[PDB]
Homo-oligomer: A and B are copies of this chain.
Amino acid sequence: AVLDLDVRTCLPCGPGGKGRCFGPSICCGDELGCFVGTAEALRCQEENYLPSPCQSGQKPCGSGGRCAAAGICCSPDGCHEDPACDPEAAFS
């Protein structure tokens, strides 16, 4: 719960729908990271009907990318490595 908005509807993607959809070909979960354009994010096509993200790691690093998943600074265009979420990006 709580996303600096109102209601986090964390679009379920990946194997069993555990990941979250961030963009057209970009889906990143907590411990599933980001599948940048894959069969798992194919279901993200319905993210066009949802103009509200799900919280999201407030790690805007790189050329404008926030930490969307462990060790990956993704933005509304691509994905980028980021030392902030690199260490067992999760705490071990």
Q: Is the interface of A mostly helix, strand, loop or mixed?
A: strand
The answer on a CB contact under 8 Å between B33 and A72 is no
Q: Across the interface, do B78 and A62 meet the contact criterion of CB distance under 8 Å?
A: yes
**Does A11 sit within 8 A of B, measured CB to CB?**
no
Number of copies: 2
A74 contacts across to B, CB distance below 8 A: 36, 78
A28 contact set on B, CB distance < 8 A: 36
Task: Give the contact-size bracket for chain A.
Answer: 20 to 34
State whether A39 and B35 are in contact (beta carbons under 8 Å apart), knowing that A25-B71, A25-B81 are contacts in the complex.
no
A45-77 contact mask (Cβ, 8 Å, vs B): 1 or 0: 000000000000000001101000111111001
A residues near B (Cβ < 8 Å) are 23-26, 28, 32-39, 62-63, 65, 69-74, 77-81
